[PDB]
Ligand binder design. Structure first.
Ligand SMILES: Nc1nc2c(ncn2[C@@H]2O[C@H](COP(=O)(O)OP(=O)(O)OP(=O)(O)O)[C@@H](O)[C@H]2O)c(=O)[nH]1
Ligand SMILES: Nc1ncnc2c1ncn2[C@@H]1O[C@H](COP(=O)(O)OP(=O)(O)CP(=O)(O)O)[C@@H](O)[C@H]1O
Ligand SMILES: Nc1nc2c(ncn2[C@@H]2O[C@H](COP(=O)(O)OP(=O)(O)O)[C@@H](O)[C@H]2O)c(=O)[nH]1
Ligand SMILES: COc1ccc2c(c1)NC(=O)CN2c1nc(C)nc2onc(C)c12
Ligand SMILES: [Ca+2]
Ligand SMILES: [Mg+2]
Ligand SMILES: [Mg+2]
Ligand SMILES: [Mg+2]
Lengths: 437, 328, 54, 427
């Protein structure tokens, strides 16, 4: 057994961590006080859930997590919330003033003050690990802390933990729920400094999650609570293989091996189905074919794009519920004849399938109905470059006038880092187009 | 009001669509780089489809189908017909074609050798010797069987090609404009030499004897139908238009899964120009598909009005039909 | 469709379906860039306090 | 995240006293500092503007400054006068005589160090100080001349804190003296360099709103300050109340100010109300949105159709459909997209607070960073040059040590501000 440490940075990272860890406890049967009656090995053990939870002598199951925000009010809700007993106070780290939606303030000015504190709190969890395999980092592209302090954290983790894998869960900026105009600046800056330090990153466009909540949950004005509970489900599907018995994606290395043949192109597209409203009185349960077919509908993706006009390098299907391989192959056979699924020539055309028999767990009183079977598809398609194109276009519009640049330069950053970062994104956009012509 | 932008100043069809939209008083035009548009009349090359459908509170529509170039490039059209089972290698209405890179070269020479034992081919320019055409290519191309026995109008002994304008809306309805045009050759068809190609190439730009028989070397369906009755004892609907409607529907139904915007965050429509070639036996052959076609002056007013009614006002409604819907 | 590497357990199964075969910076450099930016903040603050002294 | 409030001069203390009356009523604080409200939302962010004293009392973090005792004695006698900490009253005796030089160089110099001692005392008690907000007029002497001296000295001692002002612009429609364009031009030169955010409250706009819209034939300063206190309440809603957006002064500056010198905002309010008269028809969300963008609701006499919006902030107060707010806000942008710069994507952000202001069921406050505000500085620059080309009334200033060169420099810097706003009006 090898342990994984989760790190939640900024508001978006912390609040999504709240969602995921609440969901994890429900799936593994862990009470809010940390007790887990089904665990018969008191005080320790190397079961699959011990990848994410450590154990105390009294039987408490503590997440291998650390929350860090440059401003206290969000983590303070964790310190007083339903799962306050779950976490040790030392792994909840708060500053006093935030980064003010300013990458350079979170990376240079304030980040320098607190980077050594976090790294030693991270060290306290690593010493509890017999064989640490790496980190799962949750953060937003647009926030000053989520972008600025994460890229500084990712730089130092490569120094202190060189042999370790690092996976990102990144929240892509969407104007319908963001209250900052400089998110494209922060997004490009943080992607340039982090790119070589992340082995695999799952982007989540808030615009896609927002629309899924409106369309399939009939929520008129989705809140972060609506979005984060849905995002936690997808995250849970992705991490389930690390927390449960199986043979697919059993370690963080296997994520890069199965999904990322090119180091720089490490942004798999995630599609999830079915999303069913809990208020729906009558619902016909969808089949294996119907939910596998929904994985190739753009309206169900975490990022809106068209995989028909790109090429695949890898494809995983992660099923939860009443699913058997016979029905999956029958569904893949039908879908291949009716859809534009094209792989790059140097890659085998096919799917790696993982099935977990336990149906998806929904939090009581949430918006998602319980289903009999669900699937998450992780596909490394070049079509996700559309999200970089959108972001870089917005970047180019503002930067051409040098609008808001003075806020970053005034924090010690040099104007050249903007163009240097944009140049890297220009290279990234070019690599996708080479692979997917 | 509705909003639209114009990113192709060279488009004669959508220039008229811009005017008709402004004359409604319910459409306002913005600057090219303004993202808060309802409709985009986009550029022909490198249209940014990836930036469409991401403006909150705006239903967005564009006058091009992403991926339709697979049908509107000579090299892509051949590959699409030979690989798609819906059309197959034994497609009866497309001429034998082979892609050559300056390639199926060896597969092509096998057909030309069985043709050695009518062996005139076109490369796209006409030739009868296979080696000569290949020498021309190097100095991407597709070689195609040159149809040696075409239907010739009289008086004149003249070659022609038929252009049909087809509109495909956001719902993927296929609308064939009832008015087509015959682009005629004003010089009699000479089968003895292909180097002189003013009687073979029916393009308007080749027609610099221009304008003798009909104005602008353009014959519309009214006259061409009347000719077919008096000369061949048939009608344009029966002898030619059924095959044209079959070809248009077959091509577009093939690529529908790859270009449809039914469940997308933006919508697409597109006007196409299908070019047909009729042989001695009243059989229609598909020559090519044009992704950004131009109309004929007599038909600009009626066709561009129909583009608004069927493709634009169907999505953005305001405050007898000239199209034939091809059913699928 | 070839189904390979089928593994089963109480929790579930996994397998692979194939349809067609194929056809950095050191801690020293981090500390220096963070101090170069702090130097630039202190220079811009000194220029401000010098301007206010005038 | 505490804010330190300063009010300087006659106008500064009158609108400042009204501001504290309005927000104390919103937060449920009585004139004695005792909280007698009903909702705990009233106190979740009460520390931003109030210090907690002995006996569960709330004392405003306010410092009252004047060179005359007259207006401040009126404040201490007013309805909420006893709520202010008596030590925070700092005043001289000579007055400033509507003279920018007296407030900035002579009379105000004597008094400014004692103001800074009170400022320092309030700042040392702060958990984490965001910055300062100042209320003042630019046409007088104390608020204009001393107010900008204070701002310069506060920036010297707290260079990394946010400086925010509510600055009242003079207008011959509501004029005390002819030297007001002189004082305003000298002060704007300071505001351009030493503040992060300035709400331009034009007395011309307040007079026209009172006259044309509210049907008040002879407006008083009390009628003008009713509009100021309503605007000041609205623009500080997100700083005082919890919501989706827990805003602070720095995030406001970062997102509203794309270029450092262009930080002069047009405030707007809807629905426009005159005091002592209540209208009983609540507005629909389409009506709030249409009126808050109407030029007749702007507090700076500028035609927004003559410029382009760099950034826009909108705050809706009341119980309403947040979906209808999004549709209506998106409807304004999509229908007048030429007036919003294309090179700042998504430059209109919206906030919602459930507590409406006193006497309204629904309200909407507008904060626009428009390039049309150059019209305001053009107006003051024309009135300035009309007198300065003949050196008229300059003896009042040169008698306090000033040189004509300082006037020339101030005129130029404001004319540069005007041309800089015109730079981005064409781009
Ligand atoms: N999905 C999701 N997105 C969020 C959440 N909170 C904030 N965001 C998004 O994150 C972006 C803003 O970043 P934040 O995380 O709020 O900022 P931060 O990382 O805390 O950094 P600073 O506040 O600037 O110090 C916006 O695009 C928001 O839409 C959340 O809880 N869930
Ligand atoms: N297989 C064939 N047999 C006989 N004639 C052919 C032919 N292929 C092409 N032609 C002739 O060549 C002429 C022009 O060829 P083609 O249409 O492919 O070029 P083009 O694309 O530049 C004109 P457009 O785009 O307007 O259709 C046609 O009008 C037709 O008369
Ligand atoms: N809106 C408003 N403006 C005022 C008020 N009192 C004075 N003014 C304006 O402020 C200017 C006079 O400055 P004032 O504050 O009285 O002088 P000071 O005490 O030296 O700062 C003139 O332009 C007045 O119109 C007020 O209560 N409300
Ligand atoms: C132009 O874009 C923006 C404009 C304003 C803001 C932000 C972005 N983002 C922020 O965090 C602070 N903020 C606000 N500040 C204040 C004091 N009051 C507000 O009322 N409504 C908003 C929104 C808002
Ligand atoms: Ca155990
Ligand atoms: Mg934050
Ligand atoms: Mg062509
Ligand atoms: Mg006065």
């Amino acid at each position: 057994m090898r342990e994984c440490i989760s790190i939640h940075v900024g508001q978006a990272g912390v609040q999504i961590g709240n969602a995921c860890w609440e969901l994890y406890c429900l799936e593994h049967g862990i009470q809010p006080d940390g007790q887990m009656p089904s665990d018969k090995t008191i005080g320790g053990g190397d079961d699959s859930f011990n990848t994410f939870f450590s154990e105390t002598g009294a039987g408490k199951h503590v997440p291998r997590a650390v929350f860090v925000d440059l401003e206290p009010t969000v983590i303070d809700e964790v310190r007083t919330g339903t799962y306050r007993q779950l976490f040790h106070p030392e792994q909840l780290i708060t500053g006093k003033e935030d980064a003010a939606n300013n990458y350079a303030r979170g990376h240079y000015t304030i980040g320098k003050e607190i980077i050594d504190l976090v790294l030693d709190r991270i060290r306290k969890l690593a010493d509890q690990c017999t064989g640490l395999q790496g980190f799962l980092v949750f953060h937003s592209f647009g926030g000053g802390t989520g972008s600025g302090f994460t890229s500084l954290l990712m730089e130092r983790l490569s120094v202190d933990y060189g042999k370790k894998s690092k996976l990102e869960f990144s929240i892509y900026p969407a104007p319908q729920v963001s209250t900052a105009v400089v998110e494209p600046y922060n997004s490009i800056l943080t992607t340039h400094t982090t790119l070589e330090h992340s082995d695999c990153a799952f982007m989540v466009d808030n615009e896609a999650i927002y629309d899924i909540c409106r369309r399939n949950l009939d929520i008129e004005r989705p809140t972060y609570t609506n979005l984060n509970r849905l995002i936690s489900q997808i995250v849970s599907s992705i991490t389930a293989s690390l927390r449960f018995d199986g043979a697919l994606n059993v370690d963080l290395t296997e994520f890069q091996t199965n999904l990322v043949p090119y180091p720089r192109i490490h942004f798999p597209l995630a599609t999830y189905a079915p999303v069913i409203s809990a208020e729906k009185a009558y619902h016909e349960q969808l089949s294996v074919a119907e939910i596998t077919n929904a994985c190739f509908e753009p309206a169900n993706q975490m990022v809106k794009c068209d995989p028909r006009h790109g090429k695949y390098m890898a494809c995983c299907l992660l099923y939860r519920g009443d699913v058997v391989p016979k029905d999956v192959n029958a569904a893949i056979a039908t879908i291949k004849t009716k859809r534009s699924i094209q792989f790059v020539d140097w890659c085998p055309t096919g799917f790696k399938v993982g099935i977990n028999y336990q149906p998806p767990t929904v939090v009581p009183g949430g918006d998602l109905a319980k289903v009999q079977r669900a699937v998450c598809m992780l596909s490394n398609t070049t079509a996700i470059a559309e999200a970089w194109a959108r972001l870089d276009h917005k970047f180019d519009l503002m930067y051409a006038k040098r609008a808001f640049v003075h806020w970053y330069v005034g924090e010690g950053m040099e104007e050249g880092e903007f163009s240097e970062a944009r140049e890297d994104m220009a290279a990234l956009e070019k690599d996708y187009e080479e692979v997917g012509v | 009001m509705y909003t639209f932008v114009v990113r192709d100043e060279n488009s004669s069809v959508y220039a008229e669509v811009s005017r008709l939209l402004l004359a409604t008083g319910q459409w306002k035009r913005l600057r090219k780089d303004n993202p808060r548009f309802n409709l985009m009349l986009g550029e022909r090359n490198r249209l940014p489809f990836g930036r469409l459908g991401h403006e909150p509170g705006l239903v967005q529509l564009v006058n091009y189908y992403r991926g339709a170039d697979k049908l509107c490039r000579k090299a892509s059209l051949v590959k699409l017909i030979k690989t798609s089972p819906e059309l197959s290698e034994s497609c009866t209405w497309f001429p034998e074609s082979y892609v050559i890179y300056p390639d199926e070269r060896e597969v092509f020479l096998a057909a030309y050798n069985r043709r050695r034992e009518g062996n005139v081919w076109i490369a796209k320019l006409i030739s009868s010797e296979a080696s000569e055409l290949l020498d021309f290519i190097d100095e991407v191309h597709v070689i195609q069987k040159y149809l040696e026995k075409p239907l010739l109008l009289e008086p004149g002994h003249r070659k022609f090609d038929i252009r049909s304008w087809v509109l495909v809306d956001h719902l993927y309805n296929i609308y064939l404009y009832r008015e087509g045009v015959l682009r005629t050759s004003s010089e009699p068809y000479n089968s003895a030499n292909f180097q002189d190609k003013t009687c073979h190439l029916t393009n308007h730009c080749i027609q610099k004897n221009y304008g003798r028989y009909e104005e602008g070397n353009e014959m519309f369906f009214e006259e061409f139908n009347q000719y077919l009755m008096d000369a061949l004892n048939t009608t344009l609907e029966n002898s030619i238009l059924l095959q044209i409607k079959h070809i248009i529907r077959s091509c577009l139904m093939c690529i529908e899964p790859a270009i449809s915007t039914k469940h997308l965050h933006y919508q697409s429509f597109q006007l196409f120009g299908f070019d047909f070639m009729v042989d001695e036996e009243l059989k229609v052959w598909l020559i090519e598909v044009n992704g950004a076609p131009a109309c004929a002056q007599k038909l600009y007013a009626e066709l561009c009005q129909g583009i608004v009614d069927v493709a634009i006002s169907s999505v953005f409604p305001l405050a007898t039909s000239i199209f034939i819907k091809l059913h699928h | 469709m070839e189904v390979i590497e089928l593994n089963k357990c109480t929790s579930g199964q996994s397998f692979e379906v194939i349809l067609k075969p194929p056809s950095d910076p050191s801690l020293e450099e981090i500390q220096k860039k963070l101090e170069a930016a702090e130097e630039r903040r202190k220079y811009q603050e000194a220029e401000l306090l010098k301007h206010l002294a005038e | 995240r505490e804010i330190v409030h300063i009010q300087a001069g006659q106008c500064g203390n009158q609108i400042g006293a009204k501001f504290w009356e309005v927000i104390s009523d919103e937060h449920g604080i009585d004139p004695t500092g005792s909280y007698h409200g009903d909702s705990d939302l009233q106190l979740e962010r009460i520390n931003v503007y109030y210090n907690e004293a002995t006996g569960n009392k709330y004392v405003p973090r306010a410092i009252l400054v004047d060179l005359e005792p007259g207006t401040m004695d009126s404040v201490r006698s007013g309805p909420f006068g006893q709520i202010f900490r008596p030590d925070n009253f700092v005043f001289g005796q000579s007055g400033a005589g509507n003279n920018w030089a007296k407030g900035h160089y002579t009379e105000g110099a004597e008094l400014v160090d004692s103001v800074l001692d009170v400022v320092r005392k309030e700042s040392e008690s702060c958990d984490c100080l965001q910055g300062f907000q100042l209320t003042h007029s630019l046409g007088g002497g104390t608020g204009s001349g001393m107010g900008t001296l204070l701002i310069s000295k506060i920036r010297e001692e707290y260079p990394d804190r946010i400086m925010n002002t509510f600055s009242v612009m003079p207008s011959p429609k509501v004029s005390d003296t002819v030297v007001e364009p002189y004082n305003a031009t000298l002060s704007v030169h300071q505001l351009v360099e030493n503040t992060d955010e300035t709400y331009c409250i034009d007395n011309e706009a307040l007079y026209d709103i009172c006259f044309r819209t509210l049907k008040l034939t002879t407006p008083t300063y009390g009628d003008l300050n009713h509009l100021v206190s309503a605007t000041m309440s609205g623009v500080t809603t997100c700083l005082r109340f919890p919501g989706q957006l827990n805003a602070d002064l720095r995030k406001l500056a970062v997102n509203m100010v794309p270029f450092p010198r262009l930080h002069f905002f047009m405030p707007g309010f809807a629905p426009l109300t005159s005091r002592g008269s209540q209208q009983y028809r609540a507005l629909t969300v389409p009506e709030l949105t249409q009126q808050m963008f109407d030029s007749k609701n702007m507090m700076a006499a500028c035609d927004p159709r003559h410029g382009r919006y760099l950034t826009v902030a909108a705050i809706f107060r009341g119980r309403m459909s947040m979906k209808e707010v999004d549709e209506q806000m998106l409807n304004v942008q999509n229908k007048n997209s030429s007036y919003f710069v294309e090179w700042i994507p998504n430059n209109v952000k919206t906030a919602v607070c459930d507590i409406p202001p006193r006497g309204l069921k629904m309200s909407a406050t507008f904060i626009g960073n428009s390039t049309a505000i150059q019209e305001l500085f053009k107006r003051i620059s024309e009135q300035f040059t009309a007198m300065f080309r003949r050196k008229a009334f300059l003896h009042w200033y040169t008698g306090e040590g000033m040189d004509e060169m300082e006037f020339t420099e101030a005129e130029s810097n404001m004319n540069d501000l005007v041309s800089e706003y015109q730079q981005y009006q064409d781009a």
